[PDB]
Symmetry: C2
């Protein structure tokens, strides 16, 4: 059995956010309204003259809004992309998925994603309380690939690939929020805890997908190589529709102009590994972006 999987399975009790910070709720103890919810320098339009010309409380509303919006996207991703890929691995629908080490490592990740959703949901609800307060462009794609596949087995591949990519391509905001010493300490803790788990999830996915693919027959093998670039591009795309809603919700005049001038890349390093591990360096038409410093 995979020695990486083995190591990650034995290490899970010491590493996992769920085991070690289940009492995340408590972190809103000695609360300070005086710290912002989101870092200014990570906001795409932070420097726009129509933004900077908004009133202090308007800007602060936008930052709060985007902290919230980020948690909503995280939850959507786990529930709609990531978990379902893990679930399919656990339903035993792919050859080679009965292996006990795959079952252990993947089900631990399922526990992790459930707790991630809890952490982020708590963060939304606590923020909305203390601050007195749109479909993902990755899920919409997915729903449209599936709608044109008449056989279950092919939908299985698409779900699997979409989840694998989601789990190996780290959101810049996750790593940026984790290390930010200027925002609410519980915002950077939640994101740090999530990043710690997500690191192991990337290694896990690379192993599992390597094993399933080796054991996929041909309709499943060629299905997968087709799907990957469609999935990777979907996580590469940029829709600023969410930015527009946050701007309008804060009543920022010229919201459309700001977004218009706009017209944070994921760390595709894990998906690159996964491609090399599957031996597909030359077979997938995608231009892997330069690795970030985070």
């Amino acid at each position: 059995g995979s020695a990486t999987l083995g190591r990650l399975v034995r290490a899970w009790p010491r590493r996992a956010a769920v085991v070690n910070k289940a009492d995340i709720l408590d972190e809103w103890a000695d609360y300070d309204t005086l710290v912002p919810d989101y870092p200014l320098e990570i906001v795409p339009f932070a420097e726009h003259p129509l933004f900077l010309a908004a009133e202090p409380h308007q800007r602060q509303r936008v930052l709060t809004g985007m902290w919230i919006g980020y948690n909503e996207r995280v939850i959507a991703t786990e529930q709609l992309i990531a978990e379902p890929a893990f679930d399919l691995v656990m339903h035993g629908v792919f050859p080679g998925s009965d292996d006990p080490l795959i079952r252990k490592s993947v089900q631990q990740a399922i526990v992790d994603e459930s707790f991630h959703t809890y952490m982020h949901m708590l963060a939304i609800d606590r923020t909305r309380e203390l601050r007195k307060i749109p479909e993902l462009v990755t899920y919409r794609r997915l729903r449209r690939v599936l709608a044109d596949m008449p056989e279950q087995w092919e939908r299985d591949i698409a779900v699997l690939v979409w989840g694998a990519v989601a789990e190996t391509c780290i959101n810049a905001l996750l790593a940026l929020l984790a290390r930010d010493a200027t925002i609410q300490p519980m915002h950077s803790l939640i994101t740090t805890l999530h990043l710690r788990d997500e690191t192991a999830h990337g290694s896990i996915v690379v192993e599992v997908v390597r094993e399933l693919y080796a054991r996929m027959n041909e309709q499943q093998r060629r299905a997968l190589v087709r799907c990957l670039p469609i999935a990777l591009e979907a996580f590469a795309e940029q829709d600023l529709s969410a930015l527009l809603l946050e701007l309008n919700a804060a009543g920022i005049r010229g919201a459309e102009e700001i977004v218009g001038d706009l017209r944070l890349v994921r760390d595709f390093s894990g998906a690159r590994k996964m491609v090399e591990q599957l031996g597909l360096d030359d077979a997938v038409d995608f231009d892997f972006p330069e690795r970030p410093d985070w």
Copy 2:
């Protein structure tokens, strides 16, 4: 919001099996092969002449297969029935289900179910390795009901009710294996942890279903009322097809004759699910008299 739910949600970090025994894998460290996987005391047909006429290793094969089959059904019930009901609540498909407290309680329970599936899966795999080793009837009944409902809103109700019955009506094997000192210590530990979690889940389901039912439109209310007896009877039904297969695997002659009513141990201990919690749920809904179901007597072993 509900005081009871407030306290369950604050208790979850102290109480949850996932936080108490994440290192459950390590529990197989000084495994003793001589110690049985399942308690003979608890086997409905333990004293059948044909079960006694078998050889001792054949009876041990049956005991191990019964432990495995138990874990397999737990996993199926969680994956196919309990989680999908919790998942619907978290998707906001019911009026009033966007309550932060409801959301907190149900997402905590979802973390729990995911860990329960982990432990039971671990038990199967470790057992199958160390011993060198069909459709749930309740899910079959569910599928039939759903296949004949035209509208999503009504299938949502049905999924919700079936999930609530599963989570309020404690499996007898869960409670009896939990307290059993004669079997592998990891087996009684896993079921003790799951039992601790499940007791809280029953209380949570009662609060949540009451808050949801209160907010449902009239046809949703009517749908839930129709569904309850269907679910209660599905779960009051034990299937013997699995047992039958174990006996045959062990090579025991006259399997069909051996497996009788599975509703009692030979000593008289009740093996039907503890319907206590679903009775409380029906009361909280004000439905004691609108639901046509004869609840069995509460068993001594009830949580």
